[PDB]
């Protein structure tokens, strides 16, 4: 089989230029906001999180660190030992892991 | 001369609608009045293309 053989799952368009072979465009490629427009957007999110989203943060960080453990029995031990005796399903609802 | 020409080019950019905004609104509705007048009297084939503009003097 040809050594330079690839299978691509998204559409691409090749250039019809002599001596060159490349992908000149992608079909239906939409340009989002610029790097500066995204920056201003993120600054507004980070500003509100800095001003109004810092109270009660130490408790939520402990719940998040406990839920990164491998086994569930270690998560329950982490919640009981480090998070002041929190409930598994109650902390999972706070973090947003409950359906 | 370069300064005067570049200045009057700016004043006609910033200003200008003081004297030319009427002739643009006039040509704006005129551009639409003759367009609507064209659709009334013009031969359109089964696709929306005026393939007979030289049918008569009013069509041209």
């Amino acid at each position: 089989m040809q050594n330079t053989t690839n299978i691509v799952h998204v559409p691409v368009h090749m250039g019809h230029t002599h001596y060159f072979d490349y992908i000149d465009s992608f079909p239906k490629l939409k340009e989002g906001p610029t790097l500066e427009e995204n920056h201003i957007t993120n600054q507004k999110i980070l500003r509100e999180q800095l001003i109004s989203g810092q109270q009660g943060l130490e408790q939520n960080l402990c719940l998040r660190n406990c839920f990164k453990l491998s086994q569930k029995r270690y998560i329950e031990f982490c919640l009981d030992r480090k998070c002041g005796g929190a409930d598994f399903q109650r902390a999972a609802t706070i973090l947003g892991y409950t359906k | 001369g370069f300064g005067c020409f570049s200045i009057i080019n700016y004043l006609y950019g910033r200003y200008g609608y003081i004297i030319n905004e009427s002739s643009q609104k006039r040509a704006a509705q005129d551009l639409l009045d003759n367009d609507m007048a064209a659709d009334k009297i013009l031969f359109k084939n089964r696709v929306g293309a005026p393939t007979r503009p030289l049918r008569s003097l009013d069509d041209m």
């Binding site: - | 084939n45 089964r46 393939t51 007979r52 049918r55």
Partner: protein, 61 residues
């Protein structure tokens, strides 16, 4: 008016047949070569007979 011939249509009722003729007639665009006609076309005049590719007599012989 519609002329009848050996090649017939494929509709059960006459209303379906007359509806097919009305659809085909409403798409006809006359292209005449004579001046003083409402449908006049010196160039781009359409033919009114369809060509059919058939094996000729030299073909089959």
């Amino acid at each position: 008016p519609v002329k009848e011939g050996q090649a017939k249509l494929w509709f059960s009722t006459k209303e379906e047949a007359d509806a097919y003729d009305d659809k085909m007639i409403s798409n006809i665009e006359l292209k005449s070569q004579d001046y003083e006609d409402e449908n006049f076309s010196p160039v781009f005049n359409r033919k009114t007979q369809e060509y059919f590719l058939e094996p000729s007599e030299k073909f089959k012989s």
